[PDB]
């Protein structure tokens, strides 16, 4: 009732929606629609709306002032002027005097045109009149994603080994190096769950495969981590390798799996193993095919796995590669100047990532080829949701780790995601944090950055930093570029402050997997904007570097560097709290309004709401050793708080054992 559709053309059926909704017969009840060039919605905003949503893109949490691009990306550079990044989330709040929700369910290039052109105007195109748009009422913007959320599906959910910490990089590539991680962590008591394995543990960067050389027997050697409490995640990637023998490209080729050139033939895109094809994921069975291939790693007692280059990524295609060294060989002897440096550097820049590649082959989606520039966004989408649906078929009782780089919304079903390549900037924090609540609004809670900044090179404070952020995100991860200063925590000096930081995690993730349980079981936000829980207070609503997280607490990190402290506002008395480094926690009461407050590095803060408590337990060096029976309680007098807990493992929810009622 408080959902219609609006068709238009015949729209290409993704899934995004778990909810049939019929289809509305008036005129569209917003603004203008034009489907003079393509398909165009145009709203003209009041001066003090905002608008929320889009989920992973660049800027703020109010979406107002800039341009954003749904099509699925690789870029490996944040910068503000970026309008599309790896995923594609086409879900947007206007909220103020009028206030509406829309979904655009739509699976190609769709621009948001937020008041770039024009501050007062919205408008957001696309080049074929074939989308489905959601209108969503409601009295204020939360109401309408609480409503939007119930249609999507339940959210994915996580072992509760993943709220442990991981430690990433690529570059792990031998025993040595992962006894190493293992080592350099427990050594120094900085728990750790999670090991990540990129790229290199492969043979020659082959997708269910593993170096022979390096790992002979990988199932002695994943349970010598696993007795140690560390679970190795290794990595996917979308395309797979051209080679003769290679029994997943041979029954890709025989079987018709692989995406196809207009000619029948298979399209060739080179990434890190050279030459690859891509699974047709869009084909039900090629799907099947892919996705049942996980277990050749399940099989081995890997229990979690992460997929990357599902944009899909493309270094270049066949096509593209004769044409640059056809254009080289011009350069080459081209004795007059004509031909000038810039050119050449652009035609080898313009074969990476093109949208011409993109237009070079298909999808076969029931004996109906459809070009892949037309479902661009939902190929990570479908890459996942092949590997989500075979873990259910393997083992349809448990919980595996599972993320993605490129999603669409209805992806979130099977899988979370992490925001990519980011940098060792300052600015990264900022960006790592305003995600978050977007992210939430299109169903995706687990989630996370690259702590430390993943590309360039990192500095001890900004890691901390980085750190005490990831202390408060489902996915918190180290992770690092090839070549970059080394960022694992015990590559720096005082290694105790970052036992501390990391304490603090451990020491929460009772409350923190609570508070993400109840919100996934109820089509909840774990992280919200401040306007969301204080919509009376002009000032809360447009607070956009700090987070309240379920109905307890509200974060504020640190984000500027050589900053002892930070400025935030209090829309409510608050117990402001800090997880000291000798491992006592730090109490004071602020009031309602303007406060600056004093974090060191090596502190980690959040506040309690008025009327709220919540439990803390004593710090423990990995998940299954968290003691849980008798927390403490930090907060509030006569104040409850329900806490929800299970094995962590299966998937048994709707049990009253997984509740109990504390009290301070
Ligand atoms: O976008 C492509 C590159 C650029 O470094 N990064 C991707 C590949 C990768 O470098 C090796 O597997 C991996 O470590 C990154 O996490 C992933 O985003």
Redesign the pocket.
């Known amino acids: 009732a408080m959902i219609r559709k609006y068709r238009y053309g015949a729209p290409f059926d993704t899934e995004a929606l778990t909810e049939k909704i019929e289809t509305a017969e008036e005129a569209f009840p917003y603004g203008e629609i034009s489907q003079k060039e393509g398909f165009a919605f145009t709203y003209i905003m009041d001066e003090d709306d905002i608008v929320y949503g889009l989920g992973e893109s660049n800027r703020g949490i109010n979406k107002r002032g800039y341009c954003y691009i749904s099509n699925c990306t ?1 870029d ?1 550079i944040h910068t503000e002027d970026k309008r599309s990044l790896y995923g594609a989330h086409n879900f947007i709040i206007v909220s103020g005097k009028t206030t509406f929700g829309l979904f655009f369910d739509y699976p190609s290039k769709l621009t948001f045109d937020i008041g770039y052109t024009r501050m007062d105007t919205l408008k957001v195109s696309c080049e074929n009149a074939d989308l489905d748009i959601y209108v969503i009422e409601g009295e204020n913007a939360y109401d309408i994603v609480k409503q939007f959320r119930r249609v999507i599906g339940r959210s994915y959910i996580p072992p509760k080994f993943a709220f442990g910490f991981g430690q990433s990089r ?1 570059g792990y590539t031998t025993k040595e190096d992962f006894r190493a991680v293992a080592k350099g962590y427990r050594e120094n008591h900085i728990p750790i769950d999670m090991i990540y394995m ?2 290199d543990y492969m043979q020659d960067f082959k997708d269910f495969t593993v170096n022979e050389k390096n790992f002979p027997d990988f199932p002695e050697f994943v349970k010598e981590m696993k007795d140690q409490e560390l679970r190795l995640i290794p ?1 996917i990637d979308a395309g797979v390798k051209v080679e003769k023998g290679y029994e997943v490209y041979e029954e890709g080729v025989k079987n018709n799996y692989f995406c196809k050139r207009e000619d029948g033939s298979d399209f060739v895109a080179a990434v ?1 193993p050279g030459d690859t094809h891509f699974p047709d994921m869009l084909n039900p069975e090629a799907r099947k095919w892919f996705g049942d291939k996980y277990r050749f790693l399940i099989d081995q007692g890997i229990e979690g796995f992460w997929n ?2 599902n944009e899909p ?1 493309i270094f270049y295609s066949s096509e593209g590669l004769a044409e640059a060294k056809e254009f080289a060989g011009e350069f080459a002897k081209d004795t007059e100047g004509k031909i000038h440096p810039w050119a050449m550097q652009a035609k080898m820049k313009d074969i990476v990532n093109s949208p011409e590649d993109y237009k070079r082959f298909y999808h076969n989606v029931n004996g109906k080829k459809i070009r892949h520039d037309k479902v661009h966004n939902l190929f990570g989408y479908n890459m996942t949701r092949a590997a989500g649906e075979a873990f259910e078929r393997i083992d349809p009782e448990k919980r595996f780790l599972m993320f993605s ?1 490129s999603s669409y919304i209805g992806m979130h079903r099977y899988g979370g995601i992490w925001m ?2 980011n940098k060792s900037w300052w600015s990264h924090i900022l960006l790592n944090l305003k995600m978050l609540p977007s992210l939430n609004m299109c169903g995706f809670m687990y989630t996370g950055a ?1 702590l430390g900044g ?2 360039d090179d990192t500095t001890r404070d900004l890691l901390l930093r980085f750190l005490a952020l990831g202390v408060f995100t489902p996915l918190m991860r180290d ?1 690092a ?2 070549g970059t200063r080394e960022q694992e925590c015990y590559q720096f000096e005082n290694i105790e402050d970052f036992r501390s930081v990391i304490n603090a995690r451990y020491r929460l993730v009772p409350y923190l997997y609570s508070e993400y349980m109840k919100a996934a079981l109820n089509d909840d936000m774990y992280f919200k904007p401040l306007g969301f829980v204080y919509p009376d207070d002009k000032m809360a609503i447009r607070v956009e570097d700090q987070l309240m997280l379920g109905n307890e607490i509200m974060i504020a990190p640190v984000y500027e560097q050589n900053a002892r402290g930070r400025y935030v506002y209090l829309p409510e008395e608050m117990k402001f709290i800090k997880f000291m480094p000798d491992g006592s926690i730090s109490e004071e009461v602020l009031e309602k309004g303007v406060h600056y407050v004093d974090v060191a590095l090596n502190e980690v803060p959040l506040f309690i709401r008025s009327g709220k408590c919540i439990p803390v337990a004593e710090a423990a060096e990995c998940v299954k050793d968290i003691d849980t029976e008798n927390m403490q309680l930090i907060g509030y007098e006569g104040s409850s708080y329900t806490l929800y807990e299970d094995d962590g493992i299966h998937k048994d929810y709707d049990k009253k054992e997984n509740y109990r009622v504390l009290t301070k």
Do not use: V
């Open positions: 690789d490996p690529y990129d790229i990595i890190w990357d280059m990524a780089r990519g390549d690259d993943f590309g992770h570029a090839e």
